[PDB]
Amino acid sequence: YNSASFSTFKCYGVSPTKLNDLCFTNVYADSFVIRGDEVRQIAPGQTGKIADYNYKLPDDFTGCVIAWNSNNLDSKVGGNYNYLYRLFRKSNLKPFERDISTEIYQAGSTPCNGVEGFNCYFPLQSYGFQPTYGVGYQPYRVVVLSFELLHAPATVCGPKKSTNLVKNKCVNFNFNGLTGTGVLTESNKKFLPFQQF
Amino acid sequence: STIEEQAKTFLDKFNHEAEDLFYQSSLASWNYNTNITEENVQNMNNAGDKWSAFLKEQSTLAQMYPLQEIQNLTVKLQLQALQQNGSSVLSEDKSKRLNTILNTMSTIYSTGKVCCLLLEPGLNEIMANSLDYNERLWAWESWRSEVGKQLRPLYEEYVVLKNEMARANHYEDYGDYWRGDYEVNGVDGYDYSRGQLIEDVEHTFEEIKPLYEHLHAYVRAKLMNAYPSYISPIGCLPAHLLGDMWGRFWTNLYSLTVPFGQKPNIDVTDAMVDQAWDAQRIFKEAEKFFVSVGLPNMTQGFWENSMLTDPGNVQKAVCHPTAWDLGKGDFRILMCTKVTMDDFLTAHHEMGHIQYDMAYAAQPFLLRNGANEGFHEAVGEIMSLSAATPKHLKSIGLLSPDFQEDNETEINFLLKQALTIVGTLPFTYMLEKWRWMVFKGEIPKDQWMKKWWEMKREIVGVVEPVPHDETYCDPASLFHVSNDYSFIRYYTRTLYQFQFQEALCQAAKHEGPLHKCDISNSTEAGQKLFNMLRLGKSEPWTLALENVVGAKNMNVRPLLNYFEPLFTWLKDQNKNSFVGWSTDWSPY
Ligand SMILES: *[C@@H]1O[C@H](CO)[C@@H](O)[C@H](O)[C@H]1NC(C)=O
Ligand SMILES: *[C@@H]1O[C@H](CO)[C@@H](O)[C@H](O)[C@H]1NC(C)=O
Ligand SMILES: *[C@@H]1O[C@H](CO)[C@@H](O)[C@H](O)[C@H]1NC(C)=O
């Protein structure tokens, strides 16, 4: 969040400051490249070619979206055509659904036996990316993070800040969740190396 | 499914990869233009051939959908643009013959010698600076005899093949096909017809006739001082004495005819040189102007990708001023900028062109154009009209902070601008009317020259020095006629320009003469302009004209309002001299 090197960094339903120290069951990460114009399409409630046929976001999102320019990475002279995108699809996409179908999309009523032509189109299209392209036309690398929460024990948590240590002065304390007040000083008895309290 | 859904899917397919091939071809063309060499020509030709083949294949595929079923009025417009079968109806032999005729015309016009004394090398300078009657007459007659005499039968065959091809496309004539641009159908209360354009131009010319008559009388009166024994008080101006080979513009006549020659004109070239402008501060000032108007910034890649000065000795490049719309968010300007006022004004013009290009980028590929052929140059030009005012130059630090202007300078500037604005309209009208009648078939092939010179005498008031038989083809000498170019755009451009200028100036709450008006620091005028600019070709040009001026059709009253003090001064000056011309008088 403090890198400040990302064009877009939005958290949906969660505050970036408060989530910096929070416990979740699991976290999901996704990465893909879209055109800079298509950046706004990646949001709950949005609709677009990317939104409908390439990647769908559930409206009740419980994570964050990070976006930044990628022109210097995947935009070359002559066009970087190593990235595809679905322009034609029979229907929309369910949230978090991956489609890799390459069947020739049919527009009219007449079927085509896998041959391009009238009323028959290829569902996937290539992206052209050059350094001379427009700002919205430039390629962008976008990472979206989703947070999972179930009844299973949590595994991921924010970095707890550890304070200092003082002795011989009656002060409040909290060790690993054990709270209380008193005076801290050394002792002589030694625990076994698996016990606290 | 329904035809509409299939058409939508087909257009969605076409726009993608149409943008791609267009961008590839534009990049190849820019690479050739910015860096001329043998290798780049091959790439440019290959890209053009690929784009043309793709366009023909896509038109062939789009021929399948019937246009009646679509009821969207935007998919219908895109289909109407795409299903332009056009010249492919001609047979293969006929198409080959037509292409050969066009190529021969281009070649013969490009390389024409009257000797040695080519058209641009010599000839031009002789016709603009000889000041000698015999030399100008010799050059005019020699160019006519060398070019127009040889372009006669090629032009006749061109006419017959083009007329037959136009009739093959369910059009009456080729002139009707040209007039098809000014046609909008399917909208109630906004429709227009091709038969409406034959009128609505004669009306404006009849309106603007008295001003041209007064100007012609004044020019002839001031010109009879020179060439003492070759000009008559009542009669027409000899053809070769208009300061040009064809007399299209009267700019070269300014040096002979000045109302107040004592007062210098406004020129800030020395002011620019003193402050040492670096040929980029000019575009910086243009961007400042367009930002202060209310229009957005320039793209980041504009300043780095585009080249704005001569590359140097090692790298050669043609740098005629040009604004590039390569697509994919790419804008460029090709200019050899120097520290001159003319370069400043043309930089403003091209910057306005770029601003117009940025407006409709969100529209589909087929609708990324102006409303018609006249809506673009006028928008580019009104920027230069706004930037040429003394008030703007005084606002900038280049002009003197304490400048006092007299009405003598106002008259000088008004006449200088009029000699180019109102001096070319009758010529355009006469040339286009003659071409329309020739294509329509009203003028037989044996009466081309007689009717041409009769129109020249009657409408323009220009008489030929020496008679021409039917072997001569004078109109074919012009670049546009021989090279298949339309010409009514220059007639519509000035009317649209002055209407837009008046609308933007009244929106800016300006008081006084129209020629001292400026639209800088006016956000509401910029918003009103941007409302029309963002439309593109999606909506009929009548509604686009209404969105700024408020009138559906073009009106010429603002043009006369612009030139009103000049008209009054001419009426005062010409109260004694004769007004009008006599057709009977001839130089021979
Ligand atoms: C122009 O093209 C020539 C091709 O011979 C090339 O050597 C040169 O570098 C080019 N100039 C540029 C890219 O500025
Ligand atoms: C025409 O189709 C476009 C989408 O392709 C749609 O936005 C527009 O509303 C349609 N026109 C009408 C009149 O419904
Ligand atoms: C293109 O050619 C076909 C030939 O079948 C013709 O029917 C059609 O009208 C042409 N398109 C035009 C003239 O726009």
Ligand SMILES: *[C@@H]1O[C@H](CO)[C@@H](O)[C@H](O)[C@H]1NC(C)=O
């Ligand atoms: C955008 O225009 C504003 C208006 O003055 C200017 O301050 C700003 O620097 C411009 N930004 C860019 C990137 O051109």
Ligand SMILES: *[C@@H]1O[C@H](CO)[C@@H](O)[C@H](O)[C@H]1NC(C)=O
């Ligand atoms: C426009 O506003 C700028 C802002 O200071 C000012 O310098 C300039 O003189 C103004 N010009 C006009 C014509 O109002």
Ligand SMILES: *[C@@H]1O[C@H](CO)[C@@H](O)[C@H](O)[C@H]1NC(C)=O
């Ligand atoms: C306009 O210029 C003429 C030039 O002789 C001068 O006599 C006159 O006073 C000026 N002003 C007006 C209002 O005519």
Ligand SMILES: [Zn+2]
């Ligand atoms: Zn222009």
